[PDB]
Design a protein around this nucleic acid. Sequence first.
RNA 1: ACCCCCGCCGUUAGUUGCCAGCGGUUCGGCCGGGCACUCUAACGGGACUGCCCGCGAAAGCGGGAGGAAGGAGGGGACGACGUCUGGUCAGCAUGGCCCUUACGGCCUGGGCGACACACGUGCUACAAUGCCCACUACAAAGCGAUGCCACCCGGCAACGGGGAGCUAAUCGCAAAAAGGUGGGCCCAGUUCGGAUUGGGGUCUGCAACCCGACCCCAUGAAGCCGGAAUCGCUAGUAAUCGCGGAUCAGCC
Lengths: 127, 206, 125, 98, 80, 155, 60, 24
Amino acid sequence: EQYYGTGRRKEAVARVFLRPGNGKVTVNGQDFNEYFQGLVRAVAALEPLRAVDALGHFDAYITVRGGGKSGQIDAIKLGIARALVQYNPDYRAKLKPLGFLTRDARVVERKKYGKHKARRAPQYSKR
Amino acid sequence: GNKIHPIGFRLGITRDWESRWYAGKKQYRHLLLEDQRIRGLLEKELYSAGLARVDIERAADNVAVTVHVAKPGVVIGRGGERIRVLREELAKLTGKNVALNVQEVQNPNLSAPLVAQRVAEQIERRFAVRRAIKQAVQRVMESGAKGAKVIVSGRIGGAEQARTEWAAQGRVPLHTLRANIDYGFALARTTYGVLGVKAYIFLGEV
Amino acid sequence: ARIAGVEIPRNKRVDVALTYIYGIGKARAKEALEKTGINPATRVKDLTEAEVVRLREYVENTWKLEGELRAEVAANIKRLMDIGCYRGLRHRRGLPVRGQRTRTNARTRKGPRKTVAGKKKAPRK
Amino acid sequence: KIRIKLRGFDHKTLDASAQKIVEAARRSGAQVSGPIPLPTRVRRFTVIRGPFKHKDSREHFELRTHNRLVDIINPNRKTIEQLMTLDLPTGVEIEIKT
Amino acid sequence: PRSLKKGVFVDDHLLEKVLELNAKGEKRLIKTWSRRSTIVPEMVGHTIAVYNGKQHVPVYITENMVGHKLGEFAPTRTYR
Amino acid sequence: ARRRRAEVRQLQPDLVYGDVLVTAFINKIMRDGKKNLAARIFYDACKIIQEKTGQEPLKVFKQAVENVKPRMEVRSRRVGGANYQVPMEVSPRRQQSLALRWLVQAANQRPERRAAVRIAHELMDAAEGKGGAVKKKEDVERMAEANRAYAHYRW
Amino acid sequence: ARKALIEKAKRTPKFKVRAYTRCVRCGRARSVYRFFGLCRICLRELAHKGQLPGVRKASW
Amino acid sequence: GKGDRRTRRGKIWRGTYGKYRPRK
RNA sequence: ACCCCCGCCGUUAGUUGCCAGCGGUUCGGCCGGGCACUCUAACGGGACUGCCCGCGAAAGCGGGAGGAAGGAGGGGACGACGUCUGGUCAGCAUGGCCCUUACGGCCUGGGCGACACACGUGCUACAAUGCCCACUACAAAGCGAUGCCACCCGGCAACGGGGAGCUAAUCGCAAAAAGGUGGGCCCAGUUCGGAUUGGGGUCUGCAACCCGACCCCAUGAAGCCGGAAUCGCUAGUAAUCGCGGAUCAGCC
Ligand SMILES: [Mg+2]
Ligand SMILES: [Mg+2]
Ligand SMILES: [Mg+2]
Ligand SMILES: [Mg+2]
Ligand SMILES: [Mg+2]
Ligand SMILES: [Mg+2]
Ligand SMILES: [Mg+2]
Ligand SMILES: [Mg+2]
Ligand SMILES: [Mg+2]
Ligand SMILES: [Zn+2]
């Protein structure tokens, strides 16, 4: 009837809803190719599908809010990866070795004082 | 010149605030300046009583104030005549209308502020600094405490060169964020100059 | 086509081209073309004798341009310069007028650095 | 429909406070909307550590304010009885608008 | 590209003191610390002495220098 | 790197050829992390290699890298006074880094106003064995083997 | 921070632009925070004692 | 660029609005 | 190590949230409704070389499984006994010395903003992996009482007049910018770059000459990638892009 998987990346949340069907994707309304209009990376998000020969067998409604269309592309990629497991829990065996079921914990680094950008340290002359 | 205040460092845990009351934007700065006015007089007065802390709770035009002392008597007064003078001298400062409780200090020998002032005074009377210090650590260490330490600033004995005296016993982990170390500082005006006094007392842990 | 005082902007978009005039900027460009109703994109060469007349006339007569303008500006400066006007003295002395720092960064108004001898050991770093 | 809004500095002096208000009125009115959290507003004070120079000393201080809501629809006298005068915390301050 | 808005400012120390002299014609000198004030026609012909912040310099106010502000005619710093 | 032997970051394959080496090259084109413009340029280029060249872009590319990888390079070294330039092999790893870097560099050294083209044309020239990229490569080897006397300082 | 120069409390600005914060404890006019009436120093001193209600040490 | 006070960026950089970066 | 922020899961809580799921629609999650989900904030779980193979006397090293994650998972707070006669009596405190019609105090004005020059830290840039115009899309953390300012009007505009809501997860600052789409520029000191200067004007403030920021017109400099020498950063880091805050009338 329906399947779920969230998915978060670099501060992005993607609600992934798979549903046996054609293979289209409605990201926040616009078509998959409409929200990510011209982003050589987009293709990534659906990689967990091709992982187990899905896509042309499922369908996906997706809500995405937070971060940037790049982070969303990874949240969504994780969503489609999780949801694809509630469906058949047997997918892990092949879906995980790729690492799709991991939550990239790489986040912006705090901006420490004394320094220009968390690390970028100010420069000196005839020290 | 390193190391943070052992209290301010632990405020989240093993140590509560001296003024716990909500407020904001338009009031906070006014409602705080007051607290300082309060504490101002209490320390200027209740010296001989042995001041150690001045909790100040609030809710609305009915302040708290719970002065903590070693000699609760000196505070109260004869039959309670002084706690009348002050408690009144109080509203002549804050129309707010406030109470004035008084708790007694169970062994002023575990009150960093006291141990400090204790030493600060001796030094003002011209006692041998190192002695006064060792003694103090002993008293504190000799009546409970899993650790203690005292530090006197400089110009020890009126010496032209500012020095710095020590003294310590048992664990006194300033780094362990959960120690529960009472910190106390005492000044010490003198013919030759100011000399700060620091008292550190360690109790339990968790 | 030649327009204002010895003006001959050619082979570029008319707007761009009009820019080549003393008193005309990217602003008056789109306007003079706006009013005189001419495509701004037309290459000056591809213009029309009819358009070159409405432009030549609208512009030359609507704004104070070229020589006559430099005459004004020069005239102005001369004035606040004749009267004890501080601002005028800044012109004489050749230093920046709009109240900027003259301890460093004033080369655009001073010219090339005029290095002199100095004092070493006194960390001028 | 009595909307309560609780704010405090201690995230316990509220969960304690606002929780009393829940168990109390849960015996004289509706069933309460449960104490709903609400984002916290933090105030940062970045200060130079020592006096005179040392531009890169610093050390951060923040004054985080917490909020709680609750919401009791179906007000019924006894509700305004179990609540009206039975609070306890001092580091709290309420505002209610039924 | 200066600008005040609506209400050309002029301290009335010298203002109501300059026009009072307009009644008997003019006068022979003035002296105000109000270098903050704009110059109005009534000042023309006159000779107001402005303050360096140290001295009172004699400034003959002519038409050509109306809109300006007195101080612009009494230099502050000393250079070269 | 005093402690470990810093392992190589492994890159996610191409979003079209699924070739890691490509991502690498694209990363060398990128600047200010504007990885889209970077990816585009390399793909537009691949389509410029399709038109003007009846060959598959991917193979033209790899061919290029190949001719641009130096197999010997000179590394300075202090040996009794002077700093003799010792000639020596080049790690497989370093060969790539240099090849790709050199390509992008020479590519941005070309005249054609369009970024995507400079890459397109540079790659091709490289394949044929000509171009600023292969120059540097052959210049390097020349440098070594011309200092092959101090090669007994093997390093 | 001379008594004499703590005429700031005088209101009488003659014009309200001559008004200026000043520390409500040391007179440290130079970097007085509004929300406290205190200067960067005193603010730090008191925060360490705990006399600044709900003003813990930041970190993240 | 970020410096031309009479362009989009020049306005954005200077955090302002005018004939070159209207409110909308 | 005990504390804080970020990674995964669950409980409690639902005016944040969504047809997830149903009916309606000015089809705006707008309406009813619903807490599932995102989230909000409080608490609980989870990692310990705990399990498997290999070496080792042991500590542990290598490898593998599970897992969001590991062998200190990523970033903070946190700085030993002491050193430098380190820094600050100008934050405050304080010994000693000195001044008391004044080395005190009030005021107006000037100065701290001077320049032939030298250096440090930076901003903007020299351009096509770019600049300009238009259209269109994703963020976080913050701040708001005379304060944020919706929307409407007058102005090219700064801004002015009018005026709703907000006491602020429910209103405002706010537009994110880089980006995607379409057009223009066509390699030129240029639709690069904006210094400098002339003029007009807004705004704060008693007051913007000295000495404010902003807007519009004109002006349109040096600069075509930098000698010797020299600085930063090991990953979500550098690089690059915009957003907020404190101080604060305004603002350099
Ligand atoms: Mg950043
Ligand atoms: Mg002021
Ligand atoms: Mg430009
Ligand atoms: Mg073992
Ligand atoms: Mg530690
Ligand atoms: Mg010294
Ligand atoms: Mg000194
Ligand atoms: Mg200065
Ligand atoms: Mg209008
Ligand atoms: Zn202070």
